[PDB]
Amino acid sequence: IDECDQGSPCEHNGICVNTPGSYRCNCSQGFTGPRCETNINECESHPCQNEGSCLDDPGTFRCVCMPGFTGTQCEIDIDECQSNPCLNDGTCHDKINGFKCSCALGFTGARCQIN
Ligand SMILES: *[C@@H]1O[C@H](CO)[C@@H](O)[C@H](O[C@H]2OC[C@@H](O)[C@H](O)[C@H]2O)[C@H]1O
Ligand SMILES: *[C@@H]1O[C@H](CO)[C@@H](O)[C@H](O)[C@H]1NC(C)=O
Ligand SMILES: *[C@@H]1O[C@H](CO)[C@@H](O)[C@H](O)[C@H]1NC(C)=O
Ligand SMILES: *[C@@H]1O[C@H](CO)[C@@H](O)[C@H](O)[C@H]1O
Ligand SMILES: *[C@@H]1O[C@@H](C)[C@@H](O)[C@@H](O)[C@@H]1O
Numbered sequence: 001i002d003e004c005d006q007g008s009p010c011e012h013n014g015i016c017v018n019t020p021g022s023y024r025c026n027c028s029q030g031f032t033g034p035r036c037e038t039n040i041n042e043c044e045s046h047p048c049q050n051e052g053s054c055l056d057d058p059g060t061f062r063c064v065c066m067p068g069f070t071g072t073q074c075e076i077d078i079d080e081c082q083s084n085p086c087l088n089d090g091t092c093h094d095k096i097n098g099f100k101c102s103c104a105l106g107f108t109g110a111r112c113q114i115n
């Protein structure tokens with residue numbers, strides 16, 4: 001009694017393996033259950049942060065981030081001050097999807113561009 005050779009009961013192209021008196025199914029990525037019938041949806045753990053959208057494939061997820069965020073789970077608040085936008089020795093303060101400049105004395109404008 002091969003049991004597997006009489007016809008595999010595994011779904012989702014899982015591999016039937018004989019066990020003493022029975023069988024087990026070894027599933028491909030993204031599936032589980034005794035016969036590989038359960039789809040694992042990695043978005044069920046709500047991995048995408050900061051109002052990102054979660055997209056599912058077997059074995060994986062992808063987050064689509066709101067502006068201002070990056071990383072696999074949208075967990076990184078991008079530092080928009082990296083590019084030193086505040087001119088004339090201004091001080092850049094990072095914001096969500098933006099920055100604010102505190103301008104030295106004698107300068108003004110969103111980026112301290114005015115004198
Ligand atoms: C970094 O400095 C450059 C100019 O040197 C600006 O182009 C960038 O401003 C952009 O991307 C992030 C947005 O939040 C900003 O409003 C936008 O200007 C600045 O990040
Ligand atoms: C999920 O499927 C894998 C792959 O076959 C299996 O090793 C594991 O035991 C399953 N998990 C549960 C909780 O059934
Ligand atoms: C971060 O987001 C930018 C787009 O804003 C993208 O180019 C980059 O690949 C992302 N990095 C990671 C680690 O998700
Ligand atoms: C559930 O959320 C965790 C992160 O917290 C992630 O690692 C899994 O991929 C996801 O299904
Ligand atoms: C998935 O992407 C995110 C960034 C938001 O725009 C959501 O409204 C969308 O459903």
Ligand SMILES: [Ca+2]
Pocket residue numbers: 030039040041042056057058059
């Ligand atoms: Ca899935």
Ligand SMILES: [Ca+2]
Pocket residue numbers: 068077078079080094095096097098
């Ligand atoms: Ca930011």
